[PDB]
A = this chain, B = another copy of it.
């Protein structure tokens, strides 16, 4: 299983205002191939936002990453800091 972790500068709405504006966005992710779960990341004080995605395979993740970067440009996000890793299942199992 691959874990996609990315964040970017963001001035946009935070907290509940963000949950409202980006609700359609969130729902569209559940329709992405190989998508397992995402934890939405945000930081008002540092003007950043992002997310931790978990895909079944690296190919599903890279595909999403490429697409979502293009998409993020419409929110005016010019640079996307991302990292794609493999998940060590045995250890992750121990930690919940």
Which residues of A approach B to under 8 Å, CB–CB? 3, 5, 7, 14-16, 18-19, 22-23, 26-27, 29-30, 35-44, 48-50, 52, 54, 83-92, 94-96
Contacts and interface: CB of A to CB of B under 8 A. Distances in A.
A85 B26 contact: no
Nearest to A38: B95
B95 A30 contact: yes
A7 B39 contact: no
B88 A18 contact: yes
B15 A88 contact: yes
Contacts of A5: 5, 7, 41, 52
A86 to B, nearest CB: 5
Contacts of A90: 16, 19, 23
A10 to B, nearest CB: 11
